[PDB]
């Protein structure tokens, strides 16, 4: 009686992450359609993530006041309608699209901060962990499907607008299900508590470095997932061979496959490395960061040579980078005591979104514009400028790796502090 609800929620999350990244797979066309610089292309994702991080704590609090199913159904319909309306914006008005992206961010934040609570309430066993794994495995599949949907729809209909039309309709078919087949589960000072928790977590050392590391990871993931298809299209343009829907299709498929493989390999490496030292969880993550960096820079030296080498680097870097997702949560839960775990998770997500994904696309676009304005205008210069701008990603990756190394250094001391405080 509850499995149908879990399946519907998983499909809704697939739709959520498909609609989130649909803009990126057609981003180039948007930049061509509105005739704007790369600053606006960065602004789309930046405003989306900023609205998401602003709205996330509010919906997290609100989900304990009213009916969660009602809020979820309202949010899904809201974001679907906003996307559908944005799919008809005139060319002259650009900022209205950014406002629509912000509204989409609010709507998706509602779903992302509500649905996991419903799933946790539905089941209480290892089956709950299995359901959560199924739900959260919808992230890479949804991102890959979003890239594929945007590229294929642009290829087949000859217009990018249709992409922003495909996702919302399914959401409608999803939304009704949420109002119908999802059961209602009757399951169940704050400011001062939050302030005390923040004061206590500031004094914590490994938590801050883990937050910085995951902020760097979010920065890298957002910037790359936003700008890589455009960079590859520009490289194909400058390449002697003349062509880019297939490029986005390949990137999306590689993204999904690498997400699955990287999550599995990271989990397995953590399992196999726990038997040798207690600092396995951070260090492995650190290795992954390094494992990404040496490969990420590789594409910036191999993009001008051939596309196959670029895609190989994308595959390896995506795997090694996505390896940290499962381990970061364990790193967090190992240090913070259960009393403050919810506040720690909320603040870590807030900081990771703020210092990371919020500014990465806009910063990359700003760097690209600054480099391009001082140089001659030519497609080769566009591609080279975008490469030099994306060169800031591996530096942040290495900084995050060093932060993970520091977390590994302070891991045992912070664990001892946590256990002493719990037993005190």
């Amino acid at each position, epitope marked *: 009686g509850r499995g149908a609800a879990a399946a519907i929620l998983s499909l809704g999350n697939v739709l959520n992450y498909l609609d989130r990244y649909t803009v990126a797979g057609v981003l180039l066309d948007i930049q061509q359609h509105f005739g704007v610089k790369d600053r606006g292309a960065g602004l789309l994702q930046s405003v989306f993530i900023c609205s998401f991080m602003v709205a996330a704590p509010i919906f997290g609090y609100l989900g304990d006041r009213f009916n969660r199913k009602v809020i979820l159904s309202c949010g899904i319909f809201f974001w679907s309608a906003v996307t559908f309306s944005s799919s008809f914006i005139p060319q002259q008005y650009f900022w209205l699209l950014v406002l629509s992206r912000g509204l989409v961010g609010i709507g998706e934040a509602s779903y992302s901060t509500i649905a996991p609570t419903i799933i946790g309430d539905l089941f209480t066993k290892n089956t709950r962990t299995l359901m959560l794994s199924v739900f959260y495995f919808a992230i890479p599949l949804g991102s890959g499907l979003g890239y594929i949907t945007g590229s294929s729809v642009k290829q087949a209909a000859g217009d990018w607008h249709w992409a922003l039309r495909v996702s919302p309709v399914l959401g409608m078919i999803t939304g009704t299900l949420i109002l119908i087949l999802v059961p209602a589960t009757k399951r169940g000072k704050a400011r001062t508590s939050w302030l005390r928790d923040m004061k206590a977590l500031i004094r914590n050392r490994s938590y801050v470095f883990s937050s910085l590391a995951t902020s760097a990871v979010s920065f890298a993931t957002g910037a790359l997932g936003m700008w890589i298809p455009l960079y590859l299209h520009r490289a194909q343009v400058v390449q002697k061979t003349a062509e880019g829907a297939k490029d986005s299709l390949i990137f999306g498929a590689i993204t999904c496959f690498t997400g699955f493989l990287g999550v599995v390999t990271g989990a397995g490496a953590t399992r196999w490395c*726990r*038997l*040798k*030292t*207690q600092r396995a969880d951070p260090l492995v993550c650190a290795v992954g960061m390094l494992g990404s960096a040496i490969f990420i820079c590789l594409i910036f030296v191999a993009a001008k040579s051939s596309i196959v080498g670029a895609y190989i680097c994308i595959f390896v870097g995506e795997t090694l980078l996505f390896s940290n997702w499962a381990i970061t949560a364990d790193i967090l839960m190992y240090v913070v*005591i*259960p009393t403050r775990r919810a506040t720690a998770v909320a603040l870590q997500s807030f900081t990771s979104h703020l210092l990371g994904d919020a500014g990465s696309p806009y910063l990359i676009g700003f760097i690209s514009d600054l480099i391009r304005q001082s140089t001659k205008d030519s497609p080769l210069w566009e591609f080279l400028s975008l490469g030099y701008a994306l060169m800031l990603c591996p530096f942040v990756v290495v900084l995050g790796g060093m932060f993970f190394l520091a977390t590994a250094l302070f891991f*045992v001391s912070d*664990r*001892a*502090r*946590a*256990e*002493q405080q*719990v*037993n*005190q």
Partner: nanobody
Amino acid sequence: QVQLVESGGGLVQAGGSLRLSCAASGRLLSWYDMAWFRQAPGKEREFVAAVTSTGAGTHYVDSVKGRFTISRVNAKNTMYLQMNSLKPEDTAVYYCAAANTRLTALSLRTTTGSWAYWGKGTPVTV
């Protein structure tokens, strides 16, 4: 796949000093909260002392405070328990127990059901 070996148990003089050692070899010991239990001939398993993963949190029984000291060396994966001024009620079979590390109040987990790993158990006579 963790197996515990007890040592240092046996007949001792009344009120003498004794040391009990628990060794874990199957897997790394820095991932397990350990504890000692005593089975009495006329009673069931009784909690004695417990230590967390690092060693910064230790819990005892109100009838044993100030007499027994429990410590651990995670480098050699060996837990030690020094018992001094042995009362005659201390004669029992001591079992070393290990559980996966959890950030719970060690004073709350005395139920002989939370510890899924057990040792052979050595007898001590006062």
